Symmetry: C2
Subunit: 299 residues, 2 copies
């Protein structure tokens, strides 16, 4: 059934924490923090595989496929949490990046019995979203041995889809199945086996990179500006006008006056501000260039 968690870094005891139940309020947090320092280092070793991951996702994005995340508990929850930010940040379809967690919606707030052992359930979760060859499955689990995720990668592989694993123990079985193996080696957790801590931080960090970088490549932003933001509150309604001014050194309320001379679409707005085109002509420029403001602005 298991009995060889012994060989896994993720089940291993951290030396500098053996008397953590004895240490002080400040000793404990300092330690955790000292341990958190290791997380960005371990992402750093992983960057070239991460780069390649991104570039192949753009490719898929471009053939019309989707970025699909799978994971149990924390890993699952973090997949939904990256997928959730992509529309209001980048302006894309809510379907473009979907996070799937074992146990369905209830698993978001609380664990499900054996949800991570349910090899049949993943096959239904993936079938229900019409998972296809054009898609990319990113399988996520610190141990690299979660049956749910393992079976998920397999079906994906069997449909000829691009597969990526994100695990914390090297040479894992998820790593063997997948096409790109991302290996977050963070060392033993402060609490032995608590992958919610370091490993779930690494996982957030990669996911973030995966969506942020691909979206950049698709011209879903201009310079370092969030030109495709959905402004759905006061802060972003303001950042909107702020962003039009930042791109085009514009006086002032022309920034406002172009925003609703379309809709709050900073990208369109600055396009018809810089290129001095009509709203409809600014648009069709952008359409021919897949929304890449730098290309449509020419040169």
């Amino acid at each position: 059934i298991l009995k060889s968690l012994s060989t896994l870094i993720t089940e291993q005891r951290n030396p500098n924490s053996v008397d953590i139940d004895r240490q002080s309020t400040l000793e404990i947090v300092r330690l955790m923090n000292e341990e958190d320092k290791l997380v960005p280092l371990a992402i750093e070793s992983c960057l070239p595989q991460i780069s390649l991951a991104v570039e192949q996702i753009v490719q898929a994005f471009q053939q019309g496929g989707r970025l699909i995340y799978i994971g149990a508990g924390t890993s699952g929850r973090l997949g939904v949490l990256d997928a959730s930010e992509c529309p209001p940040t980048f302006g894309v379809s809510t379907e473009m990046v979907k996070g799937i967690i074992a146990g369905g919606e209830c698993a978001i707030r609380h664990p499900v019995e054996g949800a991570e052992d349910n090899t049949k359930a993943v096959l239904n979760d993936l079938q229900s979203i019409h998972f296809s060859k054009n898609d990319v499955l990113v399988g996520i689990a610190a141990s690299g041995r979660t049956p749910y995720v393992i079976a998920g990668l397999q079906y994906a592989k069997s449909l000829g889809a691009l597969t990526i694993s994100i695990a914390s123990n090297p040479k894992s079985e998820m790593a063997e199945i997948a096409d790109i193996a991302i290996e977050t080696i963070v060392g033993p957790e402060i609490l032995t086996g608590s992958s919610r801590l370091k490993s779930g931080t690494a996982q957030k960090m990669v996911l973030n990179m995966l969506t942020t970088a691909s979206m950049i490549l698709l011209g879903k932003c201009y310079e370092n500006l969030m030109v495709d933001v959905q402004a759905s509150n006061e802060k972003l309604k303001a950042r909107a006008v702020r962003i039009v001014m930042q791109a085009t050194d514009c006086n002032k309320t022309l920034a406002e006056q172009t925003l609703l001379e379309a809709d709050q679409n900073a990208k369109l707005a600055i396009m018809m501000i810089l290129s001095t085109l009509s709203k409809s002509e600014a648009k069709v420029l952008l359409e021919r260039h897949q929304g890449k403001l730098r290309n449509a602005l020419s040169k």
Copy 2:
């Protein structure tokens, strides 16, 4: 109108990423990695305020109070994330830690028009759970000025509950309304305003400290072993045996039978074995020392 935005760091541009969209794919994720490196260092400056908050929270817990997180968007989902792992890790009640997100549950997967700007609702939400003065309120917002969170903090103060603010801008209204202000200064985000990144990472590490430190101080572990684990899947089940053996040096066979007897309670099982008592007497001697496995046994 509400800008104001020029002031805040969270809204500033990151000079190290002006031509990020005209950069190599290896170059983008490496930029990100570099910025991620800055995040644990930011947490390091919050170590005294963070330890301050832990102690205070250990007390409300000991007074039968609850830890309660609030936020909209990414901060909200992180709050749900942190709380969701406390029951399965530390064996406590689903009520001891609760994440509440603006927009409510419908916000768990996607944004909700202007939910972060709601003065009411935060009232409603904080009454459906009957938030009392014994309860602790943690307001999370990178900007430091989100309406929902401020309103939430005001209602908790003008009530006498302990209040904690986590934010990424110095001298934030939230930080002033609050007793303990934790201020995670993480600098400009590579994508201007995409606080789902460093600030989101910084907020995950703070919340992980608050809960993981607390539960250690309250006895939810022995040494660095995760006793109080709930065996949900085949992995944690095997790990339960691993805990009893690492703590007693007692061979696979006995540990199993003991756990089978102690209903998969590793803390009880560890107690029955080394103190050679029964489940009845181990269970009572343990509450005599408040489930602190190192007092009960020894002392």
